[PDB]
From Swiss-Prot:
Record protein name field: Acidic phospholipase A2 BthA-1
Binding note for cofactor: Binds 1 Ca(2+) ion per subunit.
Native source organism of the sequence: Bothrops jararacussu (Jararacussu)
Catalytically driven reaction(s): a 1,2-diacyl-sn-glycero-3-phosphocholine + H2O = a 1-acyl-sn-glycero-3-phosphocholine + a fatty acid + H(+)
Function: Snake venom phospholipase A2 (PLA2) that displays edema-inducing activities (activity that is inhibited by EDTA and dexamethasone), inhibits phospholipid-dependent collagen/ADP-induced platelet aggregation, possess hypotensive as well as anticoagulant activities. In addition, this enzyme shows bactericidal activity against E.coli and S.aureus. PLA2 catalyzes the calcium-dependent hydrolysis of the 2-acyl groups in 3-sn-phosphoglycerides.
């Protein structure tokens, strides 16, 4: 669920993580539009696309199973669909981490109005 994505983000990125990430660029904040602004935004665009590939469960709402130990997250659980959601979230979180070097405050709470160009397709 996005509650867990948030927890995952805060675990991996620090407690400022949710606010840092979940209104970033054209895609962080979820169900975005337009063109990904940068690498971090592309993590979120990819994450949107990943959620779009989930069939059989609801990636926004459904609660999955994961373990957080020493800064890494590992998806598990007995429901493959929920594991798939967790994986979208884990990947995006690691993508944020990997691309922290180009995180640009310009895109923090960037605003939908700045993303009104044709959306990149999954
Ligand atoms: Ca998005």
């Amino acid at each position: 669920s996005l509650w867990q994505f948030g927890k995952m983000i805060n675990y991996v990125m620090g407690e400022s993580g949710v606010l840092q990430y979940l209104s970033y660029g054209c895609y962080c904040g979820l169900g975005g539009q337009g063109q990904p602004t940068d690498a971090t935004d592309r993590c979120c665009f990819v994450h949107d696309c990943c959620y779009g590939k989930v069939t059989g469960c609801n990636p926004k709402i459904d609660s999955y199973t994961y373990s957080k130990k020493n800064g890494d997250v590992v998806c598990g659980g007995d429901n493959p669909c929920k594991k798939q959601i967790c994986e979208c979230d884990r990947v995006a979180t690691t993508c944020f981490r990997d691309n922290k070097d180009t995180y640009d405050i310009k895109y923090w709470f960037y605003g939908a109005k700045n993303c009104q160009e044709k959306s990149e397709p999954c």
